């Protein structure tokens, strides 16, 4: 690796996604996906251990074949009354294959099989860039093509994402995996609302990006791949941990914390329309994810009962490890619920 080349790659990832957002032509958007893959394979694998190689492969297969399936749907659009634009697809089927395709691009229920695995394989920073940035392109496409979406699919994929992906993670003591399954749940929400009022989808998107942002950044602060690592850091320094936990509850959508805001608005614009049963069917599973995460909150206490907290590990020297923007996003994901009249600024 070279400290330039990483800039000349990340620049191309930013560029690719910018193209997926900007272009009004299909073939372009398909190219934007191709460039985000081509340039995102080097970011993962940064350190040469084999874990990142096998994991980066499992990303590459399903991601690339997803892209190809997208191209198939585009072409079927060309078959049926057709031109190359970005707008309502004229085929119900092309819309089907395209909702499946964009359901592989970002983790969803039948297609989520790769996300936990790849997220634990690759390192931290690649973990951040995988679960947030690349998640901007597909939503930016779905917001466009929503008029032709078959409601039954995306509603299904959303729910099954929340049920399956959310229900998962229970036995997992790893972190990266937890962040993966939670990504799939927030996915189930963002895509759940997508047909009704996409404004909320972009909302839960943004809040979500802040959430995983502070989360992974804290995992860089205290380098931790497990919960055991979290407790041991609790007896190294407290503050970073309670930031991790409070941001995890915000990841659970607990009422005073800011993570409750997308759930709450989603319940409004979800239930002013007819169906009231499905939101509750989501909120149950939401409680499941909660008291799992609060198991991870009995990971800690003071006057602790024995955690085997060891030694050597008091240190006289502070760490200089550079944390880029931690504080603004920490307070910004904790304190935001007393805002949102600001919701409409988003759209």
Partner 1 sequence: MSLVYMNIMMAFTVSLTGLLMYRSHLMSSLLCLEGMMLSLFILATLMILNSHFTLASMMPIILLVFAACEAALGLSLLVMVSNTYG
Partner 2 sequence: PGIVELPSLEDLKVQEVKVSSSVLKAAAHHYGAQCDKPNKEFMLCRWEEKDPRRCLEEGKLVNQCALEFFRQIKRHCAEPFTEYWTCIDYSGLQLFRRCRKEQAQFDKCVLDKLGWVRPDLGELSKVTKVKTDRPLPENPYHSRARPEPNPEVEGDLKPARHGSRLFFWTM
Partner 3 sequence: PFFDVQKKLGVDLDHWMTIQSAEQPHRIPARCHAFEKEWIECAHGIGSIRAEKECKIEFEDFRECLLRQKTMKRLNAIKRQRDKLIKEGKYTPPP
Ligand X SMILES: CCCCCCCCCCCCCCCCCC(=O)OC[C@H](COP(=O)([O-])OCC[N+](C)(C)C)OC(=O)CCCCCCCCCCCCCCCCC
Ligand Y SMILES: CCCCCCCCCCCCCCCCCC(=O)OC[C@H](COP(=O)([O-])OCC(O)COP(=O)([O-])OC[C@@H](COC(=O)CCCCCCCCCCCCCCCCC)OC(=O)CCCCCCCCCCCCCCCCC)OC(=O)CCCCCCCCCCCCCCCCC
Q: Applying CB under 6 A, which residues contact ligand X?
A: 3-4, 6, 8, 125, 128-129, 132-133, 206, 209-210, 213, 217, 220, 256, 324-325, 329, 335, 337-338
- Indicate which single residue of 1, 237, 284, 325 sits in contact with ligand 3PE (rule: CB under 6 A): 325
Binding residues for partner 2, how many (CB under 8 A)? 4
Number of H helices, E strands in the chain: 17, 0
The CB-of-340 to partner 2 minimum distance in angstroms stands at 8
Nearest to 248 by CA among 219, 282, 274: 219
Cβ neighbours of 168 (radius 10 Å): 20
The CB-of-52 to partner 3 minimum distance in angstroms stands at 31
Distance from C-alpha of 221 to C-alpha of 136, rounded to nearest angstrom: 25
- 7 sits near ligand Y (criterion: CB under 6 A): yes
Distance from C-alpha of 275 to C-alpha of 102, rounded to nearest angstrom: 26
Residues in 17-36 at the binding interface with ligand Y, rule: CB under 6 A: 18, 22
Give the side-chain half-sphere CA count within 13 A for 344.
1
Region from 58-66, 114-122, 185-193, 200-208 binding partner 1, contact rule CB under 8 A: 58-66
Residue 72 vs residues 66, 96, 153: alpha-carbon distances, Å: 10, 11, 18
The CB-of-238 to ligand X minimum distance in angstroms stands at 18
Distance from C-alpha of 92 to C-alpha of 144, rounded to nearest angstrom: 15
Which of ligand X, ligand Y, partner 1, none does residue 84 bind to, with CB < 5 to 8 Å depending on kind? partner 1
**CB of 108 within 8 A of CB of 187?**
yes
The CB-of-207 to partner 2 minimum distance in angstroms stands at 17
Sign, CA torsion 231/237/238/239: negative
- 5 sits near partner 1 (criterion: CB under 8 A): no
> Toward partner 3, which CB reaches closer, 83 or 309?
83
- 319 sits near ligand 3PE (criterion: CB under 6 A): no
Give me the phi and psi of 345, to 5 degrees please. -60, -30
- 344 sits near partner 2 (criterion: CB under 8 A): yes
Which residues of the shown chain bind partner 2 in the complex (CB under 8 A)?
268, 341, 343-344
């Amino acid at each position: 690796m070279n400290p330039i080349i990483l800039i000349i790659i990340l620049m191309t990832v930013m560029l690719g996604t910018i193209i997926v957002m900007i272009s009004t032509h299909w073939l372009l958007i398909w190219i934007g996906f191709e460039m985000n893959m081509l340039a995102i394979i080097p970011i993962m694998m940064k350190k040469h251990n084999p874990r990142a190689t096998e994991a980066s492969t499992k990303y590459f297969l399903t991601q690339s074949t997803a892209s190809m399936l997208l191209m198939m749907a585009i072409i079927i659009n060309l078959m049926f009354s057709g031109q190359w634009t970005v707008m309502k697809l004229f085929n119900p089927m092309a819309s089907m294959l395209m909702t499946m395709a964009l359901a592989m691009k970002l983790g969803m229920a039948p297609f989520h099989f790769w996300v936990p695995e790849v997220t634990q394989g690759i390192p931290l920073s690649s973990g951040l860039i995988l679960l947030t940035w690349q998640k901007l392109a597909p939503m930016s496409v779905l917001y466009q093509i929503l008029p032709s979406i078959n409601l039954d699919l995306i509603l299904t994929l959303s729910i099954l994402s929340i049920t399956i992906g959310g229900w998962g993670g229970l036995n997992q003591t790893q972190l990266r995996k937890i962040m993966a399954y939670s990504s799939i749940a927030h996915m189930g929400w963002m895509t759940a609302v997508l047909l009704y009022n996409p404004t909320m989808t972009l909302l839960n998107l943004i809040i979500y990006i802040i959430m995983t942002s502070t989360m992974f950044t804290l995992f860089m602060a205290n380098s931790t791949t497990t919960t055991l690592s979290l407790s041991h850091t609790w007896n190294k320094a407290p503050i970073m941990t309670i930031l991790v936990l409070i941001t995890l509850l915000s990841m659970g959508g607990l009422p005073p914390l800011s993570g409750f805001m997308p759930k709450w608005m989603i319940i409004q614009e979800m239930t002013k329309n007819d169906s009231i049963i499905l939101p509750t069917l989501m909120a149950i599973t939401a409680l499941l994810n909660l008291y799992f995460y609060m198991r991870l909150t009995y990971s800690t206490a003071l006057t602790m009962f024995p955690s085997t907290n060891n030694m050597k590990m008091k240190w006289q020297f502070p760490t200089t490890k550079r944390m880029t923007l931690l504080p603004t996003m920490t307070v910004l994901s904790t304190m935001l619920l007393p805002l949102t009249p600001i919701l409409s600024i988003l759209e």
